[PDB]
Each structure stands twice: as structure tokens, then as C-alpha cells.
Amino acid sequence: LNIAVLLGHSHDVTERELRNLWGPEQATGLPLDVNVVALLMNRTDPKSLITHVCDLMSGARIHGLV
Amino acid sequence: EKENITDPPRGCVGNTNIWKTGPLFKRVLMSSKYADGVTGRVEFNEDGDR
Amino acid sequence: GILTTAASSMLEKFSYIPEAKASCYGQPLHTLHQFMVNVTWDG
Amino acid sequence: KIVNIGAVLSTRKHEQMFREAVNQANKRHGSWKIQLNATSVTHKPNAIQMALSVCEDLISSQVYAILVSHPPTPN
Ligand SMILES: *[C@@H]1O[C@H](CO)[C@@H](O)[C@H](O)[C@H]1NC(C)=O
Ligand SMILES: *[C@@H]1O[C@H](CO)[C@@H](O)[C@H](O)[C@H]1NC(C)=O
Ligand SMILES: *[C@@H]1O[C@H](CO)[C@@H](O)[C@H](O)[C@H]1NC(C)=O
Ligand SMILES: *[C@@H]1O[C@H](CO)[C@@H](O)[C@H](O)[C@H]1NC(C)=O
Ligand SMILES: *[C@@H]1O[C@H](CO)[C@@H](O)[C@H](O)[C@H]1NC(C)=O
């Protein structure tokens, strides 16, 4: 389903490899409406954590938080 | 009455560094001995209870 | 891979897999909490 | 200087005696330069918005002690 992966600044990880992390892979994709959303965030304070969690849960009903 | 007076900053805007005198202020709360009160003689134990 | 494997293996068990909450404002039957205890992916 | 004191504190009788106790803390402690400043947040049945009220009312307030004083919740 809709699954959100969000990171900060660890290991200098960008987002383009996370776009290309699932696309050509997952040959055994049985459900249809499965999408991934990769995001970065500068601030890991709990105000913005709860804010982005509510934004992604309101963001087309994301069922998995990473 | 003590030194190293530090304050917990605006941690909701770009701050993740913890407040270093947290256990210091907690130890101040641990040594809170009182003999006044309508409920009675209030004092925190080693577990922080009445 | 663990999330998609649990979702695909729960789709064969139960049909209505997407069951989410709309928003944080304005105030459980089959979850993957009790499903992916036995999971192994990519060996 | 000034100290914000925040609490989950809605029913106005303990607003009144809380402001009274703020006045009494600046009364029986001499004429020291510290001042007090109250902060009160109200009921939310959803605890997510309780934490929302806590974070957008108490972090910028720089409070030192937070008191939950509402037992009889219907949930
Ligand atoms: C985070 O925000 C600060 C202040 O605007 C800025 O200096 C810093 O470069 C930002 N980090 C990134 C890369 O988002
Ligand atoms: C504050 O604490 C430090 C140790 O953490 C101590 O060295 C110092 O003497 C204290 N206060 C000051 C700045 O004198
Ligand atoms: C002890 O019990 C008495 C009688 O209820 C009352 O003073 C109060 O509840 C308690 N505290 C003290 C030490 O007086
Ligand atoms: C794995 O766990 C699930 C939990 O529902 C169970 O249904 C399934 O039989 C288990 N698979 C085996 C055979 O180990
Ligand atoms: C002091 O107390 C009042 C009580 O409503 C509060 O609204 C205010 O934020 C506090 N002082 C300031 C200017 O922050």
C-alpha cells in the first residue's frame, strides 16, 4: 500500500536511490495500489514529527511508516 | 539558590540538544522535603512518591 | 520488502487490506502486527 | 527572571486558586527578583491534540513543571 520512508541526514542518503529502490524490483507484487513516498527532514523535533506524521496519514492514507 | 542555571530552550524550532541540568533539576525535586500541607507532611522518597 | 511481503500474504488471507485513519483531528480487525512474526525475505 | 508554569488546567476554580498560589509563591518568599507566569491548557478527548496543545503551548513557554490535573475523563 502507500508506505512512507522518511530520513534525516544519516549516511548522506539522498532520495533518488529511494525512488529507484522499489520500481524495477518487487517481481512478486500481488496488491495493486502500492506506492512509496521518500522524504527528508531537517528537524527531528517532536512537533514537526507529529506534524509530518499527520500530514502523511492525511497524505492519501499511508499505511506504513518508515 | 544553586549555580549553573540553565533553561530548556525552544526545542520545537531546530533544537534537539537535550537540557543538560535535567537530572540536576530532577535531583532538586528528589530532595524536596516539606512539613507543611493540607494533605500533610509531603516528601519525595527514592522512588519519587509520597 | 517485509512490509510488502506481509501485505501481499495478508491479501490472500483477508480482502480489505487498506484500513487507515483519515486525519489526526476529529475526535481494529486485521493488522500486520500479529501477522509478520514469521517473516524471512531475500534469504 | 520570569518562570512559566504550565498545567492541564481548565475548570476555572483551579484557575483561580492557581493564580492565587502564584501570588502566594511571590508573597512568602521575600522580594527576590524571580517572577511567575501561568499557562493553562484545556481538555481534549483525543490525546494527539493534547500533545499538540502541550507542544505548541509549553515548549515556547520554557516551563519547568507540568501538572496533569483532570482525572474524570469519559474515555
Ligand atoms: C537546516 O536548517 C538550518 C537553518 O535554516 C540550515 O542552516 C541547514 O543548512 C538546514 N539543513 C538542511 C540541509 O536542510
Ligand atoms: C557547572 O557544572 C560544571 C560541570 O558540569 C562545573 O565544572 C562548573 O563549575 C559549574 N558552574 C560553573 C560555570 O562554575
Ligand atoms: C495524616 O493523617 C491526618 C488525619 O487525616 C491528617 O493530618 C493528614 O491526612 C495526614 N498528614 C499529616 C502528617 O498530618
Ligand atoms: C505464520 O504465521 C501466521 C500468523 O497468522 C500463520 O497463519 C501461519 O500459519 C504461519 N506459517 C507457518 C506455517 O509457519
Ligand atoms: C502569562 O500568563 C498568561 C495567562 O493567560 C499567558 O496567556 C501568557 O502567555 C503569559 N505571559 C506571556 C506574555 O507569555
Side-chain angles (χ1 to χ4, degrees):
Chain A
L1 294 172
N2 289 319
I3 298 168
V5 179
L6 194 147
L7 293 176
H9 295 88
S10 65
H11 293 283
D12 291 331
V13 175
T14 62
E15 70 273 15
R16 278 80 179 272
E17 69 273 16
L18 299 174
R19 269 74 170 270
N20 296 114
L21 189 65
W22 184 67
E25 291 85 3
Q26 191 64 41
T28 61
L30 278 74
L32 296 174
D33 51 356
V34 181
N35 287 317
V36 294
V37 173
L39 292 174
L40 293 173
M41 189 64 205
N42 196 358
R43 295 179 180 177
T44 62
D45 49 354
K47 177 181 176 181
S48 296
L49 291 174
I50 295 169
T51 302
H52 287 286
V53 163
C54 293
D55 288 331
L56 291 175
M57 187 177 73
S58 66
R61 296 175 66 88
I62 290 171
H63 294 90
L65 182 58
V66 172
Chain B
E1 289 178 353
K2 292 175 71 175
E3 293 292 327
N4 276 321
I5 302 298
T6 63
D7 293 331
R10 281 89 65 194
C12 64
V13 181
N15 290 318
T16 60
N17 291 319
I18 63 170
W19 185 55
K20 293 181 181 179
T21 59
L24 180 61
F25 185 73
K26 186 174 180 179
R27 194 267 304 277
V28 172
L29 267 295
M30 289 295 288
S31 65
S32 298
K33 184 176 180 180
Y34 297 94
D36 194 1
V38 179
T39 62
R41 184 177 179 179
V42 57
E43 187 178 1
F44 293 99
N45 55 4
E46 66 182 1
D47 292 331
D49 292 331
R50 178 65 178 268
Chain C
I2 290 169
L3 290 174
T4 55
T5 302
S8 65
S9 296
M10 193 65 204
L11 182 62
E12 293 178 353
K13 186 179 290 294
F14 187 74
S15 64
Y16 292 103
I17 302 299
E19 294 293 327
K21 187 174 175 65
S23 178
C24 296
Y25 291 161
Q27 291 184 358
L29 295 174
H30 295 284
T31 62
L32 296 176
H33 176 74
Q34 293 297 109
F35 186 74
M36 58 182 179
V37 178
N38 48 2
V39 62
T40 295
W41 182 253
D42 290 331
Chain D
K1 299 294 183 182
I2 58 171
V3 171
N4 286 315
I5 298 169
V8 180
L9 188 144
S10 67
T11 299
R12 272 72 176 175
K13 295 181 176 67
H14 47 82
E15 268 80 355
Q16 189 269 331
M17 57 74 57
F18 183 73
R19 292 185 296 273
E20 180 67 28
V22 167
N23 196 2
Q24 289 178 356
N26 290 318
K27 185 176 180 180
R28 65 178 63 86
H29 296 91
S31 66
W32 185 256
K33 294 181 176 66
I34 197 65
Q35 297 295 321
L36 295 176
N37 199 147
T39 300
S40 66
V41 297
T42 62
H43 294 284
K44 297 291 183 182
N46 43 9
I48 300 168
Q49 274 61 241
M50 288 293 289
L52 189 147
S53 180
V54 167
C55 69
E56 279 100 12
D57 290 330
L58 297 174
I59 297 172
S60 66
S61 297
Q62 297 184 354
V63 296
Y64 292 163
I66 301 168
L67 279 74
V68 175
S69 65
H70 293 285
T73 62
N75 288 318

